[PDB]
Write a structure and sequence with these properties.
Layout: E1 5-14, E2 17-25, E3 28-32, E4 35-37, H1 44-56, E5 64-71, E6 79-87, E7 103-107, H2 109-113, H3 122-132
Parallel strand pairs: 1-6
Antiparallel strand pairs: 1-2, 1-4, 2-3, 2-7, 5-6
This protein binds manganese (II) ion (2 copies).
PDB class: hydrolase
Keywords: Nudix fold, Nudix motif, dephosphorylation
Assembly: monomeric
Length: 150
Amino acid sequence: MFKPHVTVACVVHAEGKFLVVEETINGKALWNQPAGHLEADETLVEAAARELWEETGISAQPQHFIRMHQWIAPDKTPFLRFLFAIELEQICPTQPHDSDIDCCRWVSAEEILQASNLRSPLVAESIRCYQSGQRYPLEMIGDFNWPFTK
Ligand SMILES: [Mn+2]
Ligand SMILES: [Mn+2]
């Protein structure tokens, strides 16, 4: 009985730049949104907040739902990738709390779209969705009748 991978991702935007995490993946350093897998008994939004803190040490809640991408991935691993947006007034200090992440870069949209090191092609698409002006309320993919304290 098929379940797919469920991951969350955030476009974090500040002073005309986007936040990107550098992960060395076999040998080379790749760029990604702060992003990861949903875990047990966790809201998509909570997830997105957690993986942000973990991969960058920013403390922020996702502000809107941009969109969700269903994609297969080169090694056939199936994904449902939830994409979110956070605007901050100014670039804020960062500190990854995860061994996976070499560092955080704040980078221009054109730099993302032009890059040859993106972790997946969804990293660039994410910027495109962002810049289209598309956003929606969290409530779009929100939790219904939830066992646990928010
Ligand atoms: Mn992670
Ligand atoms: Mn994770």
